[PDB]
Design a protein around this ligand. Structure first.
Ligand SMILES: CCCCCCCCCCCCCCCCCCCCCCCCCC(=O)N[C@@H](C)[C@@H](O)C[C@H](O)CCCC[C@@H](O)C[C@H](C)C[C@H](OC(=O)C[C@@H](CC(=O)O)C(=O)O)[C@H](OC(=O)C[C@@H](CC(=O)O)C(=O)O)[C@H](C)CCCC
Ligand SMILES: CCCCCCCCCCCCCCCCCCCCCCCCCC(=O)N[C@@H](C)[C@@H](O)C[C@H](O)CCCC[C@@H](O)C[C@H](C)C[C@H](OC(=O)C[C@@H](CC(=O)O)C(=O)O)[C@H](OC(=O)C[C@@H](CC(=O)O)C(=O)O)[C@H](C)CCCC
Ligand SMILES: CCCCCCCCCCCCCCCCCC(=O)O[C@H](COC(=O)CCCCCCCCCCCCCCC)COP(=O)(O)OCC[N+](C)(C)C
Ligand SMILES: CCCCCCCCCCCCCCCCCC(=O)O[C@H](COC(=O)CCCCCCCCCCCCCCC)COP(=O)(O)OCC[N+](C)(C)C
Lengths: 315, 133, 133, 315
């Protein structure tokens, strides 16, 4: 069955990750203790529940969970893409190579972001961060524990972006696409996620997930409407550019100004290595540099968007 | 399919993760190195006076750790046997230092000497217990 | 004229030299980790009893260092304030342990608890000074 | 003078190290304080004198001294070799390429070993190690300090062998010579010297210097007498083989047996990381493995010597 498996793994790239996921889930669920006393629980579920409240700690089972759901997102990407989009993008009159590949990619992005954007907004709705309040982003800083949904959202985003990065590294496509700053952006994204989790800055990182996700959703929807040659694509592009300007630039300059102003004024600002209080004069430059790098990369894309608007308004 | 590039980048990333976690753990268990600075004060002959001074993060635990580290690292009990006492300031909270450089009295002081002059340590620690080492 | 091979081999050799010198220095200043093993003994509630036991290389200095390290690393004074005493065996030389596993009484013991049960530490340290942290 | 310097450094390879040595010595001696308070003293002289007795400590100025005298031995090798041996090996009727190169190398080895062998025997004469006594090799183990002559001898041997190794690495010759185990031997030699000094086993290392040096002297003398086609070379070879057997194999098996027996019986044998007492059950295998590796390499050469004796006794 060596040749059959080779052919299936060539055609369907999701069969191996599906087998891994199926095996792990069957082994975990066809058993007795499904609680933290199982060895597969550190992969299937989030660990370090503080007592029996709704607040989870951090550890190495976080790495195990992130790795297992990297495998899960690798399965989901290929399976969903093929099995669903193939039929959808073929029963729709799109006849090309570049058009089919990019409609593939943007419809998958639409699905994932439609799932993860409202999820993040719901997580930010059930906290004091409601509506990008930047003070609740610093008041109770050390934040060693996160709620259930907040932690699973955070770590699912980490697993998804880690899988994107490893796909970017383990190439399976012509790399040359004329947009390289994407590698730097992916590096900055993983650094932000990981340092945000490790150094207890997760309440600070949630608004950025929300703002990047909603912009990604609108941009992917507009590019799909472009691909289908609909004529309704310009309205969607205008909605996208307004929402991009607001949600990325206004909100992220608000967050960068919040760093400079209320990093030093809200909560604890005296360094304590014993209490793991890292909010101090030392980490302020690090936080500002990382978010400023992200915002410069976003400003570049704003320049590109304005360039395209220019072309559209004289051509 | 650059499998080796993926392996190398994952390897490096895991070393980054482990290095940062060790940084956190080591700075948490060895925090008095960053927050407390030892202040020695020679008295007469071989004996000195120990205390530590820092900001609010130099608590009584940090002062005690700094003092005992100085005692056990600046004196060699194999060459000659030493003697010391630890004196606590009980008119002081565990967390008592301010940010600015006007800090008052320490939470802990120690007098340390060699057994060649143990009478000086005995008369310099008034009625506090004296530990031999 | 492989100048780069010479540079690499000299570089590696210097890292070997530095690693071995750091091994010597670190094992000399942190020798109680290798020679002394902490022995805990819960008494009642939050309080425990500390001492260390090893061979002849676990001297009184090593026991004191091990005990204070356990006190300052197993109890969090930020969560709750603790209390402890250090009791010395004065019927014992600084170097007193044998090679074989029949070692007698330690040179130092400690009783450590939280301030939620400080009466137990007070009545468990007979008349030794009690340190707050 | 760029071309003149290039030509001189091509012809005479010792001019650059001579300039370095001359500069350092002139700067050190044309000054005031020639004692330890000078910065050049850590290069020119051995440091860490214990008070005003005859016993020196260890530190990083040991590395500085070793490096500066690596430069010195690099100068001496080339200058002596060229200026002296050229005239000597040319006024002697040796007409070849292989013959001239090897007579070069063996006469330099004769000079260096004639200097360093009696030196080592004199160092071992003014101690209790006299005549390869193996108990004084362990009685006062921790040995943090060494006498003046003992330290300068030890560190000069270290500098000479380090320079040999770096020449072996930075190749300037056809490497292929049919004897590669020499690289492994050089690795073992530097490991032995460095670990012997660092871990306070210098009294244990001095007999090996003596035994290897005297054997090197006799072997080089015999090979030179071979090169000159003298006819007296066979007597020298017999003297060399007897002295090789005794001084290397008998003495070094005596030292290896001394490890196993009196490593555990003489002096301190209880490990103490605070007092830097490393003579224990842990370092016994390390010491035995290093000296056994050296003795296996020597046994190989004994096989070669017996092979040559065989050829000489049936041909
Ligand atoms: C004391 C010491 C202690 C130390 C302490 C230290 C502690 C450390 C500090 C603690 C740290 C705390 C930190 C807290 C923060 C926590 C963060 C957590 C996580 C957050 C990160 C999340 C990461 C998400 C980021 C992302 O998501 N990042 C991603 C989002 C990011 O990577 C991806 C971005 O979304 C990329 C966006 C690019 C946009 C452009 O692309 C648009 C182009 C220009 C136009 C369009 O697109 C094309 O151009 C099509 C091209 C495609 C192409 O460009 O190739 C094509 O044709 O195929 C098309 O334009 C045309 O085509 C017009 C056409 C016709 C016309 O107009 O007439 C013409 O003109 O030609 C239009 C639509 C046609 C419409 C016609 C109406
Ligand atoms: C608790 C935890 C703590 C941890 C603690 C741990 C602490 C660590 C442990 C602490 C450690 C303590 C350790 C203490 C030790 C301290 C040590 C300090 C330093 C000591 C090291 C010094 C290093 C010196 C080593 C050296 O010096 N090492 C060096 C010495 C070593 O590297 C070099 C050796 O000396 C190499 C010797 C090789 C010998 C062969 O070569 C000989 C050949 C076979 C014969 C001959 O040589 C040739 O063969 C000529 C060939 C040349 C050729 O072979 O290419 C040619 O023709 O050109 C020729 O043979 C013929 O030619 C005969 C010919 C005619 C005939 O017979 O009829 C024939 O038959 O063909 C004869 C003479 C012709 C005579 C005719 C009578
Ligand atoms: C520079 C890279 C290495 C730094 C020095 C490594 C220190 C290792 C141990 C040295 C001795 C030691 O423990 O010092 C300690 C001081 O505490 C430490 O061990 C600090 C460990 C340093 C770890 C550095 C690696 C992590 C770097 C992370 C950079 C910040 C992350 C920023 C992300 C954006 C004091 O002990 P003592 O002598 O009082 O007993
Ligand atoms: C394996 C390579 C690395 C080993 C672990 C490195 C340890 C670095 C510091 C860790 C924390 C620490 O200081 O542990 C110390 C233990 O002491 C040490 O730091 C030991 C340092 C290990 C250095 C190893 C490098 C040198 C290896 C040399 C091998 C032997 C040489 C043989 C030559 C032939 C205890 O501190 P504490 O937690 O009680 O306070």
């Amino acid at each position: 069955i060596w040749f059959s498996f080779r052919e299936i793994s060539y055609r369907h790239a999701w069969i191996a990750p599906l087998m891994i996921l199926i095996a792990v889930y069957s082994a975990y669920f066809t058993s007795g203790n499904t609680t933290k006393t199982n060895v597969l629980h550190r992969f299937v579920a989030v660990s370090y529940q503080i007592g029996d409240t709704n607040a989870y700690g951090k550890g190495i089972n976080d790495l195990c969970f992130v790795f297992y759901y990297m495998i899960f997102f690798t399965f989901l990407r290929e399976f969903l893409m093929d099995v669903v989009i193939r039929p959808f993008a073929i029963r729709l009159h799109v006849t090309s190579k570049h058009r089919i590949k990019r409609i593939m990619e943007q419809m998958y992005a639409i699905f994932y972001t439609g799932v993860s954007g409202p999820f993040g907004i719901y997580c930010m709705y059930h906290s004091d961060l409601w509506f990008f309040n930047t003070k609740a982003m610093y008041r109770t800083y050390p934040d060693f524990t996160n709620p259930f949904l907040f932690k699973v959202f955070y770590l699912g985003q980490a697993a998804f972006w880690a899988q994107q990065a490893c796909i970017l590294v383990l190439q399976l496509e012509k790399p040359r696409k004329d947009h390289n700053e994407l590698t730097f952006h992916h590096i900055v994204t993983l650094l932000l996620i990981w340092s945000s989790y490790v150094f207890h800055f997760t309440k600070m990182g949630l608004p950025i997930y929300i703002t990047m996700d909603v912009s990604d959703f609108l941009l992917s929807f507009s590019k799909t409407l472009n691909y289908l040659d609909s004529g309704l694509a310009f309205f969607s592009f205008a909605i996208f550019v307004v929402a991009w300007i607001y949600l990325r630039h206004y909100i992220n300059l608000k967050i960068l100004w919040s760093v400079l102003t209320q990093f030093r004024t809200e909560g604890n600002y005296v360094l304590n290595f014993a209490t793991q209080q890292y909010k101090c004069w030392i980490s302020l430059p690090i936080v500002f540099v990382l978010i400023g790098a992200l915002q410069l990369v976003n400003l570049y894309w704003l320049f590109l968007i304005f360039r395209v608007l220019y072309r559209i308004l004289w051509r | 399919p650059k499998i080796f590039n993926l392996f190398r980048v994952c390897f490096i990333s895991l070393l980054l993760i482990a290095a940062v976690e060790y940084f956190k753990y080591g700075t948490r268990i060895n925090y008095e190195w960053f927050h407390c600075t030892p202040i020695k004060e020679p008295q007469s002959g071989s004996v000195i006076k120990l205390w530590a001074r820092g900001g609010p993060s130099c608590d009584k635990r940090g002062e005690y750790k700094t003092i005992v580290k100085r005692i056990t690292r600046d004196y060699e009990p194999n060459d000659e046997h030493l003697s010391f006492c630890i004196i606590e300031n009980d008119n002081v909270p565990p967390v008592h230092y301010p940010i600015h450089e006007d800090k008052g009295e320490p939470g802990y002081v120690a007098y340390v000497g060699y057994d060649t002059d143990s009478e000086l340590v005995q008369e310099l620690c008034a009625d506090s217990t004296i530990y031999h080492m």
